Design a protein around this ligand. Structure first.
Ligand SMILES: C[C@@H]1CC(=O)[C@@]2(C)CC[C@H]3[C@@H](CC[C@@H]4C[C@H](OS(N)(=O)=O)CC[C@@]43C)[C@H]12
Ligand SMILES: [Zn+2]
Length: 258
C-alpha cells in the first residue's frame, strides 16, 4: 500500500508515512501575486544549460524523469536567490486529467494544465543524497504549462513516451536540450519549501517562473496516455499526479520583478 495520487493513497494520506507532510515549509503553495513583495536584492537567474547531457527517460510509477549526467559541472543554476552553484540532475512534470488542473503551484488560485520541475543540487554537498538532507540542498526551477501553441522543444519528449508507458520502463534519451523548455522571461517568485512527493524533505529553494510555456492539446494528451501501473497490471492512466497547495505558514514569497 505505497503512496500515490488515488483516494486511498493520495496526498491527504502521505502524513501517516511522512509526518513532515504537515511541516513548516511544505510545497507547493499558492502564489498570491499582490502579497509577493518585489525584492530589489534578488539577482537575475543564471541558467547555463549549453553543456547539459541527457542520458535516459524513466517512468517511475508517479511521473517520467528525464535524467542528466551530473558527474561534471556542466548544466548549472546559480544567481537569483541562490548562494553557490546547483547542478541539474533531472526534470519531470505534474499534469491533470483536464486542462483546468495539473500544476502544483497556483497563481492567485489559478491552476495551469501542467508544471515542469528542473531539479538541481547544491554542489557544496558533493552528491544529491547528501544535498536533500540540507535546508539549502536543492533548487527547483518551476515552469507552468498552458495549452495553446505547440512547444517544438517538447516534442522529442512527447514522442518517446509510447516506449515508457508503464512503471519501471526506461528508454535511452541522449542529446535532449532543456533550453527548448524555457520561456522568454526569467522573471520569478522564490520561497523556501520542500519536495512535493514523499519523502517531502524540506530541502528546496523554489524558483517559479512567472511566464508559462505554451504546449499543444496533442502534446499534453500524450502525457495523459502514460500509466501509473506496471506492464500487465490493470490500466491506471497517469493523470492528476499533483500535490495541492499547502499552508504558507511563516514564509514570504519574493518577486524578482516589479
Ligand atoms: C532521489 C530522491 C530521494 C527520494 O527518495 C526520491 C527518489 C523521491 C522522489 C524524488 C527524488 C528526487 C528527484 C525528484 C524531486 C521531486 O520533487 S519536486 N516535485 O519537488 O521537484 C520529487 C520526485 C523525485 C523523483 C528523491
Ligand atoms: Zn515535481
Amino acid at each position: 500500500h505505497h503512496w500515490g495520487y488515488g483516494k486511498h493513497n493520495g496526498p491527504e494520506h502521505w502524513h501517516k508515512d511522512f509526518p513532515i507532510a504537515k511541516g513548516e515549509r511544505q510545497s507547493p503553495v499558492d502564489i498570491d501575486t499582490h502579497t509577493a513583495k518585489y525584492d530589489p536584492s534578488l539577482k537575475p537567474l543564471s541558467v547555463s544549460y549549453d553543456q547539459a547531457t541527457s542520458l535516459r527517460i524513466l517512468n517511475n510509477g508517479h511521473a517520467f524523469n528525464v535524467e542528466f549526467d551530473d558527474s561534471q559541472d556542466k548544466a548549472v543554476l546559480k544567481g537569483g536567490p541562490l548562494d553557490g552553484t546547483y547542478r541539474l540532475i533531472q526534470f519531470h512534470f505534474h499534469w491533470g486529467s483536464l486542462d483546468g488542473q495539473g500544476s502544483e503551484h497556483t497563481v492567485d488560485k489559478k491552476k495551469y494544465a501542467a508544471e515542469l520541475h528542473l531539479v538541481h543540487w547544491n554542489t557544496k554537498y558533493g552528491d544529491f543524497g547528501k544535498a536533500v538532507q540540507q535546508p539549502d540542498g536543492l533548487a527547483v526551477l518551476g515552469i507552468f504549462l498552458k495549452v495553446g501553441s505547440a512547444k517544438p522543444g517538447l516534442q522529442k519528449v512527447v514522442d518517446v513516451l509510447d516506449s515508457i508507458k508503464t512503471k519501471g520502463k526506461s528508454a535511452d534519451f541522449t542529446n535532449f536540450d532543456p533550453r527548448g523548455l524555457l520561456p522568454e522571461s526569467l522573471d520569478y517568485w522564490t520561497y523556501p519549501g520542500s519536495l512535493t512527493t514523499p519523502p517531502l524533505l524540506e530541502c528546496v529553494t523554489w524558483i517559479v517562473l512567472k511566464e508559462p510555456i505554451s504546449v499543444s492539446s496533442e502534446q499534453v494528451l500524450k502525457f495523459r496516455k502514460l500509466n501509473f501501473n506496471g506492464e500487465g497490471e490493470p490500466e491506471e492512466l497517469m493523470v492528476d499526479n499533483w500535490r495541492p497547495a499547502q499552508p504558507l505558514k511563516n514564509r514570504q514569497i519574493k518577486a524578482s520583478f516589479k
